[PDB]
Write a protein that binds this DNA or RNA. Structure first.
Lengths: 177, 114, 79
RNA sequence: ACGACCAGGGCUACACACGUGCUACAAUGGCGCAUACAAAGAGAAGCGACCUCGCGAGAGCAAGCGGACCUCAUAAAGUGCGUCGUAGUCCGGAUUGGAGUCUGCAACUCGACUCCAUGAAGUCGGAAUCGCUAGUAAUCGUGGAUCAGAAUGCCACGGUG
RNA sequence: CUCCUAAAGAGUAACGGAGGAGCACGAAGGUUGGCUAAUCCUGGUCGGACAUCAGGAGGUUAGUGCAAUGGCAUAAGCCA
């Protein structure tokens, strides 16, 4: 709960005056971090999806949730209901203990780091970015690697606009190119 | 292990293992091992972590990594946007350095098509 | 790839360039010296470089300094 | 003017097809260090040592040599030791980026070479087809003509065999 | 079997206008508990017009083992 403690004491009162909020409840928060791993090719073989989810299980310590196809589409030749990918949502301190684990360990590892973008916001104050490599995390060892599949990470915030959204993660020293 | 050049070199003779970095050949690998103080015939295993930190400190002096890829892309892009002769040869995938195009341009032209 | 004892430029083109910059903006410079090196005082002028049959207009920019003039006038037609 | 002079360009193009070669796909090998044994040639607007500087291509200075005398000029395969351990690899070198050297009025089209970096195809080749009978084939270096510079071609020479 | 013809109860003909059935299911039945779509927009590794993720819009335009009609949010739809 490092940045969690760092949240309630430091980033609140700088933001409280930055936007001149009347109540502390107006400051944005961070609800959940959900990691998505769209396998897509597991239809060929499903032995690779379990170990694919085994990786995502090691990144966050949570057993993943296998997502199914919402509807049949032949453009990627899948019928509705096929195991298509896994996901994990993180809340509470498990989100925090992961939220510092990348910003202080997930940031200084990506190949040819150039910094995150400031335009990748939903438009209502929620950020999302995708990492291409899975060997960027300390948990997953390089020795045990059957594939180089990435994953998406989206940040759900109670912010109302992107300005309030970018201001919050900037307070956590987020790399903004 | 791993180097400031993200890439993970194999566990083999240090002089050849350091070549896996993009931008480090044999000469630069020998120079890195000489300026660091590590022998060339020792494997990447049997190397202390303090010695790998030393190798990182020396490879940090070179522009050898996606950074170098960026500088090469920038130069080729400058050539192409300038519209000079080499820029046009880069635009069309034809040999740039005066080689004959009547025959033998298969590296730049790729597999032949009738 | 010429030695490091100084770049080459034809003298007539050099005097043309000095007369063009000292007299203010002028017409395109018609030249056949494709082998002359582009110098920093040629930035802003448009030199019409011969390509074998025509004089191709080449507007010189700061990014062109160091190139030869013939590098911006292709001599072979291919479609 | 189908004659003559000039500058620039082309003969160097590039969807493709063929002939002749060079380099490879490796362990009968690659790399590193040490070391052995040739023949035939050329040289005065030329060959250019020794020494100094440069990672190197080379540069500066400057002998000797119209040459069984001096220079090109260190032969390489080989041999000894070490390493690599069958992998697109310490095989392979294409291609490309950057930085240079030299010749030459002038290396853009369109030179050769050096350094750093990158590291394509290629793991022995379908139908078919070529050369060779002994110091031959195979393989390894060396020199000369043309030539300011530009040999994987040509012409010659020896080593192993 | 469903709709129209059929004239606002029922019924109502033509070699009138349009479509279906000759099954399926031990769960796709019972019950308890829970749940709420289509489509589109924005952002996001491979990933594309279209896969999974997040948010907003939208409000059933979705869904119902199968034709049509009438129904269906207390859901008759979806999950255990």
């Amino acid at each position: 709960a490092k940045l969690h403690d760092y949240y309630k004491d430091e980033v609140v009162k700088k933001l409280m005056t930055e936007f001149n909020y009347n109540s502390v409840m107006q400051v944005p928060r961070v609800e959940k971090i959900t990691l998505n791993m769209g396998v897509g090719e597991a239809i060929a073989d499903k032995k690779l999806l379990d170990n694919a989810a085994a990786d995502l299980a090691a990144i966050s310590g949570q057993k993943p949730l296998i997502t199914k196809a919402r509807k049949s589409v032949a453009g990627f030749k899948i019928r509705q209901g096929y195991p298509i990918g896994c996901k994990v949502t993180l809340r509470g301190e498990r989100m925090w203990e992961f939220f510092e684990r990348l910003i202080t360990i997930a940031v200084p590892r990506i190949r040819d780091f150039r910094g995150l973008s400031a335009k990748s916001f939903d438009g209502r104050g929620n950020y999302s970015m995708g990492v291409r490599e899975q060997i960027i995390f300390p948990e997953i060892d390089y020795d045990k690697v059957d594939r180089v599949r990435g994953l998406d990470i989206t940040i759900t915030t109670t912010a109302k606009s992107d300005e309030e959204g970018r201001a919050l993660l900037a307070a956590f020293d987020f790399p903004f190119r | 292990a791993r180097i400031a050049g993200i890439n993970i070199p194999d566990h083999k003779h240090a002089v050849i293992a350091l070549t896996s970095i993009y931008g480090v050949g044999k000469t630069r690998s020998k120079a890195i091992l000489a300026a660091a103080g590590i022998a060339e015939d020792v494997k990447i295993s049997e190397l202390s972590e303090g010695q790998i930190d030393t190798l990182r400190d020396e490879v940090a002096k070179f522009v050898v990594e996606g950074d170098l890829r960026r500088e090469i892309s920038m130069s080729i892009k400058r050539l192409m946007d300038l519209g000079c002769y080499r820029g046009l040869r880069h635009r069309r995938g034809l040999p740039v350095r005066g080689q004959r195009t009547k025959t033998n341009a298969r590296t730049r032209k790729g597999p032949r098509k009738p | 790839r010429s030695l490091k004892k100084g770049p080459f430029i034809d003298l007539h083109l050099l005097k043309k360039v000095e007369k063009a910059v000292e007299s203010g903006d002028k017409k395109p410079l018609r030249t056949w010296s494709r082998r002359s090196t582009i110098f920093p005082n040629m930035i802003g002028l448009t030199i019409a470089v011969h390509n074998g049959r025509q004089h191709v207009p080449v507007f010189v920019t700061d990014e062109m300094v160091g190139h030869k003039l013939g590098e911006f006038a292709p001599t072979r037609t291919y479609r």
